[PDB]
Amino acid sequence: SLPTYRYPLELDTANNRVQVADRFGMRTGTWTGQLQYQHPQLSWRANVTLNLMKVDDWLVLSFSQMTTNSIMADGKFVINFVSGLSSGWQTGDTEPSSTIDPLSTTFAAVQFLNNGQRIDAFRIMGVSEWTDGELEIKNYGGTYTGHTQVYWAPWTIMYPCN
Amino acid sequence: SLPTYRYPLELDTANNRVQVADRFGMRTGTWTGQLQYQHPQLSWRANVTLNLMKVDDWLVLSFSQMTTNSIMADGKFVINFVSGLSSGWQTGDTEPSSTIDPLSTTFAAVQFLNNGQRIDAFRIMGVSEWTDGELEIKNYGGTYTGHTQVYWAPWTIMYPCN
Amino acid sequence: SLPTYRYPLELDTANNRVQVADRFGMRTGTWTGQLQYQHPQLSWRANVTLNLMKVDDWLVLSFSQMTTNSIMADGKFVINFVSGLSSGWQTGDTEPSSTIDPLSTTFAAVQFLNNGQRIDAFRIMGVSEWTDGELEIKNYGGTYTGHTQVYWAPWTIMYPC
Ligand SMILES: [Cl-]
Ligand SMILES: [Cl-]
Ligand SMILES: [Cl-]
Ligand SMILES: [Mg+2]
Ligand SMILES: [Mg+2]
Ligand SMILES: [Mg+2]
């Protein structure tokens, strides 16, 4: 008896052809919410919109340029996927497929604004944890100087998500 | 009636076995051309050879070490895939599978040369656009100093390409 | 006559359903051994544990924070997968699927310790070669200062495997 096929595999009945679904290589969405920065001496919330892309067994988060308040030498960022996901996306779709820490690391290019001067620097960001829809991205450090505001260039980060 | 299979799925007729093609996990090539740097105050073309690799639904570009003329604080790099691709590759094979911007970001390690002195720095590069075979990689910034020449360490960048 | 299926494809006989194996999207392991640093003027070995993850046709190496001896402006790191792999993993499972150099590059955030002072900097790391179980990660450079010790923040690197 002929088998059925489980996603990403699918049967195209018009041509009687088994294939990998086109959505598997690319599924887009957006998340609109508040990016939370957390540190014992400083915490804030900034309104952001991220582009999302599921590519095979990976989830890619794409940040456009942003201006945020000042940050400490290290700290953590939290994205709450409980609300804000575009249609077709469920909170569970952002859950990592492993509990290894870090799952992924990337660098974000920033300018620290101090007085009137812009100081180019970097921030190392690690996907560290997911708990009931809340994704934790730890900022371990990077180059630092005293500042009043942060200009973040665009950046992407991805993690295994199946 | 028995179905047919669409790439990356294939039927190995010798053993009557359905499998994912071996080329899906790795398909190599090269691109030989001129890397274009663009900025309103400074533009140039540098002869380069890139190694390419299609890994699942991703395209990886691999740059070897290079020496280029000086650059501005920000600007853009253009790779014209209209010509220069090795055999088996078509221009269309480099097209991203989404219009999200940035699709991907990476850091390139550089040394800025300022008459004898080598100044270590970084450049953030973002895959930004593809138009009729021309790939645009924006350089948002990074650390900077006045210089006459740039020594680029090797780097890779990848983007969803299905 | 009905075909058979080669991994990652599999037939779930209970439901007569063809699927991609769940392990294909994620297979974990660990490697315990000595990370080797090599340079003509300075060489050392440091005891480390890495987390590994096979994700589709990629292998991800995940480093936790570490403190190592000093390093030169450039040099190379060698991970010997001949021993130390957790159960279910063979040395051959870490072999890259191409000889292109670099296969992948990433940045590691560090602090260079110069007797009391911590200097934030970066290191560019490239997956460069694999020879009989020995993976070579070249450190092309990055920002640098004279130092006595290195504090490395956690980092991941991956390559087609
Ligand atoms: Cl859900
Ligand atoms: Cl074409
Ligand atoms: Cl083996
Ligand atoms: Mg402030
Ligand atoms: Mg010049
Ligand atoms: Mg020492």
What's a quick, concise take on this entry?
The first copy, chain A, has one helix at 22-25; strands at residues 4-5, 9-12, 17-20, 27-38, 44-55, 58-63, 66-69, 75-80, 104-114, 117-131, 134-142, 149-152, 155-160. By secondary structure, chain A is an all-beta fold.
Question: Could you name the key traits of this structure?
Answer:
homotrimer, 162 residues, mainly beta, Adenovirus Type 5 Fiber Protein (Receptor Binding Domain), 10-stranded antiparallel beta sheet, 59% strand, binds chloride ion, Outer capsid protein sigma-1 (chains A, B), viral protein, triple beta-spiral, beta-barrel
Q: Which helices and strands appear, and what pairs or packs with what?
A:
Three copies of one chain form a homotrimer.
Chain A: E1 4-5, E2 9-12, E3 17-20, H1 22-25, E4 27-38, E5 44-55, E6 58-63, E7 66-69, E8 75-80, E9 104-114, E10 117-131, E11 134-142, E12 149-152, E13 155-160
Antiparallel strand pairs in A: 2-3, 4-5, 4-8, 5-6, 6-13, 7-12, 8-11, 9-10, 9-12, 10-11
The structure holds chloride ion (CL) (3 copies) and magnesium ion (3 copies).
One chloride ion is lined by residues 90-92 of chain A.
Region (Head) (chains A, B): 19-162
Family (chains A, B): Belongs to the orthoreovirus sigma-1 protein family.
Protein name (chains A, B): Outer capsid protein sigma-1
